[PDB]
Amino acid sequence: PVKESSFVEKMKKTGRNIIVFYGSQTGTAEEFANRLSKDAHRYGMRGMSADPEEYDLADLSSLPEIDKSLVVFCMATYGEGDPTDNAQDFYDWLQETDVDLTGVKFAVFGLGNKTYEHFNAMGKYVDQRLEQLGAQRIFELGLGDDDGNLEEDFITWREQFWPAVCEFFGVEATGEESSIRQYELVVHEDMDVAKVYTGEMGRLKSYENQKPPFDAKNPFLAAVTANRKLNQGTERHLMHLELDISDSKIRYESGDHVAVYPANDSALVNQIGEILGADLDVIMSLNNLDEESNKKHPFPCPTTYRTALTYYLDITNPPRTNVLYELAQYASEPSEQEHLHKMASSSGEGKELYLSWVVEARRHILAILQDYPSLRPPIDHLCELLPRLQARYYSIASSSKVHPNSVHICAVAVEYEAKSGRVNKGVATSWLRAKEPAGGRALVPMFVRKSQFRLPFKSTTPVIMVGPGTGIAPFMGFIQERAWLREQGKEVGETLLYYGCRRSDEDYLYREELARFHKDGALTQLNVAFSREQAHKVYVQHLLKRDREHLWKLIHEGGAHIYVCGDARNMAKDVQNTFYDIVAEFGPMEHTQAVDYVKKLMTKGRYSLDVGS
Numbered sequence: 001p002v003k004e005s006s007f008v009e010k011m012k013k014t015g016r017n018i019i020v021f022y023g024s025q026t027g028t029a030e031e032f033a034n035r036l037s038k039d040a041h042r043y044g045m046r047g048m049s050a051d052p053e054e055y056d057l058a059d060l061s062s063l064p065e066i067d068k069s070l071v072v073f074c075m076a077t078y079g080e081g082d083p084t085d086n087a088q089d090f091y092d093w094l095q096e097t098d099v100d101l102t103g104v105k106f107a108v109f110g111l112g113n114k115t116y117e118h119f120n121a122m123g124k125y126v127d128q129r130l131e132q133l134g135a136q137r138i139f140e141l142g143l144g145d146d147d148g149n150l151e152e153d154f155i156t157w158r159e160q161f162w163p164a165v166c167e168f169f170g171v172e173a174t175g176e177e178s179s180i181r182q183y184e185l186v187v188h189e190d191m192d193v194a195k196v197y198t199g200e201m202g203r204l205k206s207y208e209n210q211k212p213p214f215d216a217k218n219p220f221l222a223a224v225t226a227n228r229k230l231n232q233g234t235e236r237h238l239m240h241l242e243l244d245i246s247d248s249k250i251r252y253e254s255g256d257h258v259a260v261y262p263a264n265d266s267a268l269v270n271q272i273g274e275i276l277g278a279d280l281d282v283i284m285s286l287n288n289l290d291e292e293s294n295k296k297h298p299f300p301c302p303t304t305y306r307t308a309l310t311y312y313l314d315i316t317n318p319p320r321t322n323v324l325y326e327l328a329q330y331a332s333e334p335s336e337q338e339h340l341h342k343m344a345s346s347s348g349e350g351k352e353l354y355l356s357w358v359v360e361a362r363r364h365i366l367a368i369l370q371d372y373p374s375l376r377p378p379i380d381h382l383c384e385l386l387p388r389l390q391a392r393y394y395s396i397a398s399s400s401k402v403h404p405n406s407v408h409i410c411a412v413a414v415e416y417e418a419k420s421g422r423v424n425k426g427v428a429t430s431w432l433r434a435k436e437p438a439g440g441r442a443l444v445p446m447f448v449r450k451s452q453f454r455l456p457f458k459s460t461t462p463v464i465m466v467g468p469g470t471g472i473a474p475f476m477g478f479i480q481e482r483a484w485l486r487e488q489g490k491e492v493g494e495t496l497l498y499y500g501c502r503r504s505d506e507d508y509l510y511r512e513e514l515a516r517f518h519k520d521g522a523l524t525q526l527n528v529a530f531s532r533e534q535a536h537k538v539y540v541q542h543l544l545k546r547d548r549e550h551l552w553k554l555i556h557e558g559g560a561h562i563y564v565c566g567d568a569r570n571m572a573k574d575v576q577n578t579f580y581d582i583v584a585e586f587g588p589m590e591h592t593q594a595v596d597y598v599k600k601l602m603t604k605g606r607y608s609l610d611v612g613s
């Protein structure tokens with residue numbers, strides 16, 4: 001990872017006084033940065049965004065060489081309160097450096113989520129650390145809560161931030177407003193076909209010419225071997241997929257995640273085009289008007305609107321306030337121009353409307369286009385606004401020791417009645433479902449992501465796995481592997497599964513496979529919880545609570561490892577208590593002593609989580 005030159009120097013040479021580093025994976029932090037960066041301009045200053053992984057943040061000490069200089073960090077938290085991948089260098093650095101940042105003015109906005117225990121560790125860290133080094137805080141730390149509404153949290157913060165800035169430095173709010181574009185449109189007519197991106201993510205033609213290694217930037221088109229329906233009932237659609245990675249040299253261990261780069265719904269794309277009156281089959285490119293930025297285009301180019309809407313753009317999520325504000329200009333009917341503008345208010349009714357009519361109603365772009373017919377923006381400007389389509393992750397359901405040449409996926413297809421009035425569909429799950437094992441084959445641009453979730457190294461350590469619904473996913477690989485080790489002579493301690501589902505004839509995933517593993521003995525216990533076969537709910541905690549005596553015997557004496565995968569707002573929290581209570585009873589020990597004991601197993605590597613909401 002060859003770093004770029006002193007960003008301070010670039011700022012000097014490009015007349016910029018504020019830089020906004022973004023630490024993110026799904027791009028939300030990146031978005032905020034770009035917004036905060038563009039914002040800078042309307043207040044007499046000029047800023048720029050930047051990936052800290054491309055620079056050496058050691059130069060912060062040089063930043064004071066620029067008048068009215070100030071750095072801003074938009075950081076998100078992951079894993080064990082860990083930084084985003086790209087924010088890793090920055091982190092390790094802040095920890096090891098002793099550098100003096102005297103004269104450095106900063107501000108930090110962190111993206112977190114209250115379900116997790118390490119709420120905005122990064123944000124809190126950077127803010128607090130930069131001070132210890134010497135830099136002076138120009139504005140309070142921002143704690144954005146995604147479980148509530150990060151967007152609004154950002155708004156509220158941003159709104160107070162600029163004035164503070166303006167005041168500390170004595171600068172004007174320079175009239176504000178009047179749309180400013182980032183890219184410039186360039187339509188191509190002669191464009192040699194063989195050089196137009198068709199949905200590749202990295203180098204031109206990387207999808208056709210597959211050359212390792214394969215990473216997020218160079219995914220590996222994997223053939224869909226099997227795509228079966230796992231649920232017996234019809235309430236929902238749960239599926240088991242098997243991606244063939246032969247000849248990819250891609251390594252992986254049960255507990256890792258695999259990511260996919262899906263394609264939006266054809267019909268949904270056609271309509272956006274149609275309702276705008278634009279020819280989606282036009283070949284074009286959006287070159288940055290700043291001939292200095294490294295981000296030459298909003299996405300791969302040259303390409304066609306259809307390709308961008310289909311593979312490069314997120315056209316299904318609720319548009320964020322700034323995208324709607326920018327569009328307000330393209331709505332002829334005033335009534336509508338107003339709502340759109342108002343969408344980015346910090347408070348008032350504008351806020352409530354953006355919160356219920358857009359977010360709560362899950363209204364995506366096309367929906368808003370249909371509901372505000374006077375809104376007919378230019379297709380090229382829309383693409384510059386829409387955010388980038390992300391890859392979806394999946395707990396690899398298989399074990400490397402048994403399926404080295406294949407990755408398995410257990411997923412629940414997303415589909416629901418939105419209050420917007422229509423039916424929304426999960427981008428990747430709908431895409432995945434439509435893959436028929438069968439150019440001709442069914443390929444899925446994927447790539448693996450290593451994780452922390454891992455079976456114990458020592459084959460005799462007791463494993464306790466709590467994974468209701470699709471939470472069982474990673475655990476299918478766990479059991480396969482522990483089954484293997486036994487067929488390999490290896491001595492295997494207890495292996496217990498604590499699974500859950502509605503009814504044994506609705507969503508009892510791997511009812512049969514799990515039946516085998518149990519019969520043969522691979523699974524010491526197979527405690528399953530049918531939450532709907534009786535008046536009262538029977539969740540997995542109840543089972544854990546039921547086996548308190550035994551579990552505590554492997555946790556406290558057998559040094560067993562606890563694994564938790566699935567829902568994070570409830571399932572995980574409820575389970576975590578039950579463990580507090582098991583420890584507190586059989587300890588014995590007050591709640592506090594127990595809560596700690598558990599959290600220790602958590603840090604001492606014996607209690608792993610892998611939840612989301």
Ligand SMILES: Cc1cc2nc3c(=O)[nH]c(=O)nc-3n(C[C@H](O)[C@H](O)[C@H](O)COP(=O)(O)OP(=O)(O)OC[C@H]3O[C@@H](n4cnc5c(N)ncnc54)[C@H](O)[C@@H]3O)c2cc1C
Nearest residue numbers: 392393394395410411412414416425426427428429470473
């Ligand atoms: C580390 C990790 C591991 C994961 N492992 C798995 C796994 O093993 N199996 C699996 O199925 N998924 C897993 N996921 C979730 C997975 O990545 C996808 O989010 C999921 O498959 C749906 O993606 P989609 O693109 O089809 O849906 P999208 O189009 O992206 O839509 C999903 C979004 O729609 C919204 N939504 C969903 N239902 C409703 C509703 N009823 N009403 C209103 N809004 C709603 C939510 O905001 C949700 O985030 C994992 C995620 C992470 C981060």
Ligand SMILES: NC(=O)c1ccc[n+]([C@@H]2O[C@H](COP(=O)([O-])OP(=O)(O)OC[C@H]3O[C@@H](n4cnc5c(N)ncnc54)[C@H](OP(=O)(O)O)[C@@H]3O)[C@@H](O)[C@H]2O)c1
Nearest residue numbers: 468469470471501502531539566567570571610611612613
């Ligand atoms: N981050 C990850 O790695 C990961 C992996 C898998 C799933 N998930 C997340 O979990 C959510 C749902 O997953 P899912 O569809 O697969 O599960 P699910 O089908 O919705 O539910 C599975 C089982 O859990 C039960 N349940 C509901 N509330 C519970 C509680 N408080 N304690 C214990 N069991 C409870 C259900 O019963 P009832 O419905 O009848 O109440 C059912 O028996 C999604 O939001 C998804 O993001 C995250």
Ligand SMILES: Cc1cc2nc3c(=O)[nH]c(=O)nc-3n(C[C@H](O)[C@H](O)[C@H](O)COP(=O)(O)O)c2cc1C
Nearest residue numbers: 024025026028029076077078079112113116119120
């Ligand atoms: C796998 C995963 C792990 C997360 N872990 C944490 C965490 O430990 N602490 C926290 O405060 N937020 C956590 N979050 C929430 C994110 O910090 C939040 O969604 C943020 O907006 C992500 O930023 P991005 O879009 O810029 O990548 C996690 C999200 C995911 C999907």
